[PDB]
Structure 1
Amino acid sequence: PQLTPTLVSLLEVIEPEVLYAGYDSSVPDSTWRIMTTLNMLGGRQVIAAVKWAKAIPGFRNLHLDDQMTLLQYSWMALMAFALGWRSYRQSSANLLYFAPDLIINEQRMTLPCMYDQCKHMLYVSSELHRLQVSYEEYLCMKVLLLLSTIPKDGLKSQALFDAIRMTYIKELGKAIVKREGNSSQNWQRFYQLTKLLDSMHEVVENLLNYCFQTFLDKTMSIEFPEMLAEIITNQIPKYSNGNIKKLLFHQK
């Protein structure tokens, strides 16, 4: 614990503070103007995630090509999941807290296609408050999402990886026990939370093909930052042939 370390404490303090979208609301809102701003925001969050990833105890020890394969596969999972947490802890509505200087309210919610997509996102935020997921449970789950998707033929450093993943699985278990202690449903909850994790593959699948659509469709006004553009241009291939292995806690 103190003597040495908890991974969940060493995490809670590598956890990135919110970034400000830099949105100017002195002007009317629009579908394009929002999505484009979010993408821009997304690019900065992902850079704020690249650090996080390397500052994750155990991460920097994988094969270079692995550590970036992981970030490339799961950046959406990280962004979407952290989206929920901000919405949850910051607000409470079927809204979304992308930044303190940018919140999609039921007003912006009603924009052209704004909600078609804001859908799958809203979801993750629902569960987190439903299961009253705790900051300690959330932080472990978020790490596990980074470690949720690998190349179809496994990583290069598969052994070391499998070892790290299991560590944070146990850390998640630790979190569940260390909340209240009413063991009664602890294993119940562990089942649930890892079920949540498994379902993030779904929400990512959907959020990703819309990311890909807005990125290929040059009629829409949506623009992407350099950082995201490179990651996306690299992922559209893989996701358009089949090189991907989605890890599951329950092959139900």
Structure 2
Amino acid sequence: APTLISLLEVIEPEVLYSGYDSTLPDTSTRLMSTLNRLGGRQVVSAVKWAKALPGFRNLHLDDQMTLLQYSWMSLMAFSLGWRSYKQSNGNMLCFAPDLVINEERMQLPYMYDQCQQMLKISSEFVRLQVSYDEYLCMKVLLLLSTVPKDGLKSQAVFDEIRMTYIKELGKAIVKREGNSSQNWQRFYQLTKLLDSMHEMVGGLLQFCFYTFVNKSLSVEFPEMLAEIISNQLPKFKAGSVKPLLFHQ
């Protein structure tokens, strides 16, 4: 009292609106710029969320910043996948209630390849019939799934918090009223979905960096994302970012 899962439910960020103006036809530039502004605001909410996670603030501040800096795209894409799963059963990308991207609007320059990759995340929720509590536990593990190759400043704390939420995901599984063999296979399928996020998010990040560095595209980024992207960029090309996999 209170259960950990009940706390994750109450700290989940509320969905934000985009204010997108659909009066006139869409353009790839106006759409990407609107999404980045929305993305910057969702990341601010994600920081508020992470600070309320039990155990997170026991980490060194530099580690709190590293984890959020390394995993923000995977958090946003995983939440987009969930919203799209509940709204359209994975048929459309529900970036926001006032900005839904169906198969038509994806037929824009720079949009199609990345939007298809994000539809694939939503379709995994459909195939596996993920529950809300399973989703909340998996989303915490994403925050704890990408670390520096040289380790964190408080590795001991990090290792224990990560196991705390691995166990919590198990509790969410057991709630489905399955036997031991079923619960282990369920856990296997969900830890495989988490591992696949690293590759599916890789292409999203590679393209985010592309639109950020090439100013010719006229794509606008909020200061929140600009600061994170520019600081995150030299670490990736240097190969100092290692994902944490359940399966090798």
Q: How far is the alpha carbon of 1:67 from its aligned partner?
A: 0.3
Q: How far is the alpha carbon of 1:184 from its aligned partner?
A: 4.2
- Structure-2 residue corresponding to 1:195: 192
- Structure-2 residue corresponding to 1:65: 62
Q: How far is the alpha carbon of 1:167 from its aligned partner?
A: 0.4
Q: How far is the alpha carbon of 1:93 from its aligned partner?
A: 4.4
Rounded Cα–Cα distance in structure 1 between residues aligned with 2:118 and 2:177: 29
- Structure-2 residue corresponding to 1:180: 177
2:167 to 150, 170, 185: 170
CA contact (8 A) 1:39 1:224 kept: yes
Count of residue correspondences: 248
What is the TM-score of this pair, normalised by structure 1? Answer: 0.96
- Structure-2 residue corresponding to 1:6: 3
- Structure-1 residue corresponding to 2:39: 42
- Structure-2 residue corresponding to 1:142: 139
2:86 alignment partner AA: R
Superimposed CA distance per residue, residues 27-76 of structure 1 (whole angstroms, 9 cap, x where no aligned partner): 21111111111011000000010000001111011000000100000000
- Structure-1 residue corresponding to 2:216: 219
- Structure-2 residue corresponding to 1:33: 30
- Structure-2 residue corresponding to 1:151: 148
Pairing 1:94-173 to 2, within 5 Å after superposition: 94-173=91-170
SS at match of 1:219: helix
Superimposed CA distance per residue, residues 199-245 of structure 1 (whole angstroms, 9 cap, x where no aligned partner): 11111211111000000111212110000000000011100111112
1:54 alignment partner AA: K
Q: Which runs of 5+ in 2 are unaligned?
A: none
- Structure-1 residue corresponding to 2:21: 24
CA contact (8 A) 2:90 2:126 kept: no
Q: Which runs of 5+ in 1 are unaligned?
A: none
SS at match of 2:103: coil
Q: How far is the alpha carbon of 1:133 from its aligned partner?
A: 0.5
1:208 alignment partner AA: L
1:224 alignment partner AA: F
- Is 2:74 aligned against 1:86? no
What is the alpha-carbon root mean square deviation over aligned residues? 1.1
What is the TM-score of this pair, normalised by structure 2? Answer: 0.97
Superimposed CA distance per residue, residues 59-113 of structure 1 (whole angstroms, 9 cap, x where no aligned partner): 0110000001000000001001001000001112432000001000122122233
Rounded Cα–Cα distance in structure 2 between residues aligned with 1:212 and 1:172: 32
